[PDB]
Amino acid sequence: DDEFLDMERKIDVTNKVVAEILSKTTEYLQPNPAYRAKLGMLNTVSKIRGQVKTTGYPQTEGLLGDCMLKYGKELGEDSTFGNALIEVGESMKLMAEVKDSLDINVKQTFIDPLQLLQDKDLKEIGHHLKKLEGRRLDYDYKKKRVGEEVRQAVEKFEESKELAERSMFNFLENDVEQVSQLAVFIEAALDYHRQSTEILQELQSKLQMRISAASSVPRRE
Amino acid sequence: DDEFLDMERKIDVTNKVVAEILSKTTEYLQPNPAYRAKLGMLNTVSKIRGQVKTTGYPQTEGLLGDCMLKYGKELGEDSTFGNALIEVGESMKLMAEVKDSLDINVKQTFIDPLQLLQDKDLKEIGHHLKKLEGRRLDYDYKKKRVGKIPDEEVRQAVEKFEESKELAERSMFNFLENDVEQVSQLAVFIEAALDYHRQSTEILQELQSKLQMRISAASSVPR
């Protein structure tokens, strides 16, 4: 009955992390409350929606991209800054899709998975623990003489007791499944950073050249 | 005199561009309004006794890492998931530290310099033009009164009006001629985001290597 209390506190900790990792992650994607979907919407596992943001939100990078492009054009094709702006905004727009993906890939590939874990094994463990605890109470009170009752009460207490140790031990003997999940997250985060590097590197060059050409001519005084 | 009016429309767009980049950049760094302010105050630290770049605010990556550290240890020295959770949380701590540098460095080398372009170069120009509206409004006054006032009454009204138009003109010209320097400021910015992503890719990988082993060693085991 000791292991029990110990395996329990562990699933108990397991629960706290899943929720926490979920919110902390979901937040990592959209730090701004204004552009972070309702929890109700983020609580659904949509195999056709990885959206973590609110309908239409261009993503920060997109907003930084639109303005550089709008105003860069206004400045005319004769201004080095306006033309560079158009190129930088162009890049920023492509930086918004690479982010849209990070969001999506993490929603459906890491968050929803941790959610199915919540809605299945954990919830199941819960009822096994909740039924048990309940079975445990009606027995204490009853084991002090009633009137076929004391009988099928104990047998009910054991069923629920083992059944609670089964699914619970068979989960704390699972671990590795959750660890593989984490990995799925790091992988998704990896493309986002590598792909964001490639775009920025491209832009970096496109800008290093513009400066050079413009700098190899004596600016009018 | 559009050659003039064209230069004004430009300097006009510039500010709209500049101010917009200042807010969008800031929101980029800190989507969460709670720390946008705590970000415009960031200073570069001296490192005589260590390299600690404090921020004054958490980074999402840091938050997340904390939760994994806290419950990972709580799980148990024997738990595989907690053991993995601890290692992953630690990485998150570096991810955060790298985030702090993007904030600081973009603030220092892109936002402050760009705010400076406002508080000085664009201000000086906004001023000369404002100064010219007066001469131009005054000029047109004495002009509407030729024959009703001295000869120097209108002659001066033009000089200070032309000596001004040329001041606002020459001033707009120089700024628009060195915008090369601004594409240069954008280059300092991209360099910042660029650096930040690579050092992030560097951390993630190190961890992914360790995670595989962890997952492998946890499966190539008896039950």
Per-residue burial over B157-187, b = 16 or more CB atoms within 10 Å of its CB, e = otherwise? beebbeebbebbbebbeebbebbbbbbbbbb
Structure tokens at A164: 């609670």
CB A37 within 8 A of CB A51: yes
Amino acid (one-letter) located at A30: Q
Start-to-end CA distance of chain A, whole Å, equals 88
Of A21, A176, A207, the CB nearest to B68: A21
Per-residue burial over B70-109, b = 16 or more CB atoms within 10 Å of its CB, e = otherwise? bbbbbbbeebbbbbbbbbbbbbbbbbbbbbbbbbbbbbeb
Structure tokens at A204: 């970096």
Amino acid (one-letter) located at A134: G
CB B188 within 8 A of CB B76: no
Distance of CA A102 to the CA centre of its chain: 10
Contact between A67 and B201 using a beta-carbon 8 Å cutoff: no
Q: Cβ-count burial of B196 within 10 angstroms (0-12 exposed, 13-18 middle, 19+ buried)? A: buried
Contact between B211 and A28 using a beta-carbon 8 Å cutoff: no
A36: which strand partners? A53
Contacts of B201 in chain A (CB under 8 A): 190, 193-194, 197
Distance CA B90, CA B73 (A): 12
CB B150 within 8 A of CB B58: no
Of B75, B88, B183, the CB nearest to A207: B183
Contact between A186 and B200 using a beta-carbon 8 Å cutoff: no
CB B26 within 8 A of CB B33: no
Distance CA B176, CA A102 (A): 39
Distance CA A79, CA A9 (A): 65
Break chain B into its structural domains and give their ranges: 1-223
With CA atoms as reference, the chain A residue closest to B183 would be A81
> What values do phi and psi take at A146, rounded to 5?
-135, -105
Structure tokens at B85: 């959770």
> What values do phi and psi take at B8, rounded to 5?
-70, -45
Structure tokens at B192: 């910042």
Distance CA B188, CA A194 (A): 20
Size of interface A-B (CB pairs under 8 A): 176
Structure tokens at B198: 């690579």
Distance CA B108, CA B97 (A): 16
CB B196 within 8 A of CB A192: no
Distance CA B12, CA B122 (A): 9
Amino acid (one-letter) located at B64: L
Distance CA A54, CA B120 (A): 39
A53: which strand partners? A36
Structural gaps in chain B: residues followed by a C–N separation over 2.5 Å:
none
Structure-token match 């929606």, residue found: A49
* Interface mutation target, options A5, A75, A83, A173, chain B, most CBs of B under 10 Å: A75
Contacts of B63 in chain A (CB under 8 A): 24, 27-28
Q: How many residues does chain B have?
A: 223
Distance CA B19, CA B31 (A): 17
Contact between A20 and B207 using a beta-carbon 8 Å cutoff: no
**Which CATH number applies to B1-223: 1.20.1270.60, 3.40.50.2030, 3.50.50.60, 1.25.40.10?**
1.20.1270.60
3-state secondary structure chain B: CHHHHHHHHHHHHHHHHHHHHHHHHHHHHCCCHHHHHHHHCCCCCCCCCCCCCCCCCCCHHHHHHHHHHHHHHHHCCCCHHHHHHHHHHHHHHHHHHHHHHHHHHHHHHHHHHHHHHHHHHHHHHHHHHHHHHHHHHHHHHHHCCCCCCCHHHHHHHHHHHHHHHHHHHHHHHHHHHCCHHHHHHHHHHHHHHHHHHHHHHHHHHHHHHHHHHHHHHCCCCCC
Distance CA B29, CA B34 (A): 12
Contacts of A189 in chain B (CB under 8 A): 204
CATH number of A1-221: 1.20.1270.60
Of A13, A182, A204, the CB nearest to B84: A182
Ordered alpha helix ranges (H), A75-216: 80-106, 112-117, 123-142, 149-169, 176-215
DSSP H or E stretch at residue A9: helix A2-29
Contact between A183 and B212 using a beta-carbon 8 Å cutoff: yes
Distance CA A179, CA A197 (A): 27
Contact between B211 and A182 using a beta-carbon 8 Å cutoff: yes
Distance CA B148, CA B101 (A): 68
A167: left (phi over 0), alpha (psi -120 to 50) or beta: alpha
Structure tokens at A193: 């950073």
Of B25, B85, B183, the CB nearest to A64: B25
CB B169 within 8 A of CB B125: no
Distance of CA B160 to the CA centre of its chain: 39
> What values do phi and psi take at A36, rounded to 5?
-115, 120
Structure tokens at A4: 């029990």
